[PDB]
């Protein structure tokens with residue numbers, strides 16, 4: 361009940377956060393009874409909002425719907441409601457305001473970028489009564505939430521998955537926007553380059569081996585401190601190669617030991633056969649041989665030698681048996697055959713997809729630093745088209761499209777943002793504001809010849825973080841057919857590449873859209889390179905793979921096709937951040953920190969500024985809410 365609202369808000373139900381201790385020092389330093397009352401007021405307020413997030417939750421309503429003991433204490437209820445509303449925990453997203461916004465606005469903020477982070481922060485600042493203007497370079501909102509819509513076909517070229525609802529703010533948004541979320545079936549048969557499926561035994565064996573290898577790299581990093589080598593940071597790819605080499609060495613060693621067991625037994629057989637030949641000489645000589653006493657003696661001796669031979673013949677058979685078993689029970693010659701390595705490279709490509717970067721670039725120590733904060737519940741696709749979310753957030757906002765920022769000026773007095781119209785470069789716009797919120801992607805901030813100049817130039821710590829962090833890349837190919845020729849009960853199926861270098865080329869296909877749309881993925885080293893290929897050629901290669909899997913006659917020519925090129929997109933310059941070898945979690949926090957030339961003037965939000973939820977739409981959303989709170993605290 362009330363316990364669940366705190367979980368849905370990413371908070372502990374029986375504890376107080378660092379932030380709450382800072383804002384409510386009287387309660388933390390006071391008696392624990394007041395703390396329990398505080399926590400119930402907070403949890404109950406969150407439950408009221410989450411039960412019905414389509415309408416603003418007012419202080420008055422909170423008092424009206426509160427329990428009898430706690431509705432008496434109104435000052436505490438107000439303090440709690442104000443705290444939650446400011447930080448974007450109870451009144452965020454699209455909601456029906458019960459009271460219109462005041463005509464008088466108390467501050468001027470220019471927000472660069474109209475992605476989820478920008479739109480969320482703008483909606484919050486508007487909610488708080490500030491004058492907000494968004495500058496967006498594209499001819500559309502959403503940024504890295506891009507939805508292709510033509511005829512009946514709807515497909516996401518950017519963000520496409522809600523990674524669980526338990527604790528996800530996107531849950532609330534989904535109720536506000538009426539997102540059509542659909543579960544993804546966890547079933548992905550693999551098909552080799554020839555088009556024949558990977559049998560279950562091999563699929564399962566390789567997958568088990570992939571998981572074992574990855575856990576091994578984790579052990580090296582954390583237990584053995586294998587993190588710095590020859591004054592260079594260890595990449596995940598490095599560690600994977602180290603682990604693979606150790607396993608290959610174990611195979612060679614076991615094979616060698618078995619070889620030696622066989623040679624020793626073979627040597628024993630050779631020695632025994634020589635011994636037997638000698639005994640046959642002896643027996644054949646004694647056979648050639650009181651005289652009746654002599655006969656009795658010779659026959660006695662001959663039977664003794666013959667029984668002596670019998671013992672050795674039994675032992676001959678027994679050593680022959682041991683040798684035969686060893687000849688028929690060897691260990692594997694190689695750890696991974698060619699086909700084994702290709703299937704394993706498919707799994708590596710899936711990892712490169714998840715992190716939108718080649719594994720040789722991921723920090724071994726920190727590439728999965730955010731795994732502790734992952735959300736509960738089945739992962740979901742957006743059937744309505746993820747663009748439905750930003751478009752809903754944009755309603756009622758002062759958004760200037762086709763306006764590309766080229767300079768940001770910030771001083772102790774105020775700020776200037778200079779922008780150019782992309783449609784006609786000749787006309788230029790100047791916007792004077794109190795504060796600037798930058799949600800420019802990390803790729804755009806990384807641009808060596810800068811697209812946006814800062815006056816004064818950004819400080820050393822900020823620029824160093826921007827250099828250190830990784831900004832990955834990942835691409836999609838949308839194929840729209842008239843009929844479904846694939847298996848509807850599999851949302852995913854893989855294509856195993858021929859080379860380790862190209863393992864990430866069209867390695868994955870989604871058939872998750874209930875309409876006849878197929879989505880082919882380009883991860884790792886292939887992502888950057890294949891942007892330089894024409895769309896007809898990429899689609900021909902996709903068709904070739906699908907023909908190989910289903911029959912050349914079974915796949916028609918597609919009716920519609922679309923290719924994303926996110927690294928070339930000048931407004932993205934990649935897909936989303938990843939934790940590069942040089943970088944760590946603290947760099948994300950550094951991105952989030954604002955700049956002061958006094959009070960702070962330049963603020964930062966976006967996918968690359970939230971430690972615990974990077975590379976995600978919900979992370980963008982939460983960063984937007986966080987910076988809205990920060991700016992409202994500063995200017996109100």
Ligand SMILES: Cc1cc2nc3c(=O)[nH]c(=O)nc-3n(C[C@H](O)[C@H](O)[C@H](O)COP(=O)(O)OP(=O)(O)OC[C@H]3O[C@@H](n4cnc5c(N)ncnc54)[C@H](O)[C@@H]3O)c2cc1C
Pocket residue numbers: 472473474475476477478495496497498501502503504505517518519520521522523763764765766799800801804811812834835836926930931932934935936965966967968974975976977978979980
């Ligand atoms: C292929 C792909 C798939 C993804 N899949 C998922 C997924 O399944 N789940 C998930 O959670 N996340 C996913 N993401 C990541 C997700 O899209 C981001 O985490 C999120 O959209 C970040 O939003 P943002 O506003 O911070 O950045 P953006 O969306 O990039 O917003 C920045 C905005 O600034 C604009 N801009 C850029 N330069 C300028 C300029 N000079 N002047 C003015 N405006 C400018 C851009 O046009 C853009 O609108 C995916 C990303 C990619 C590339």
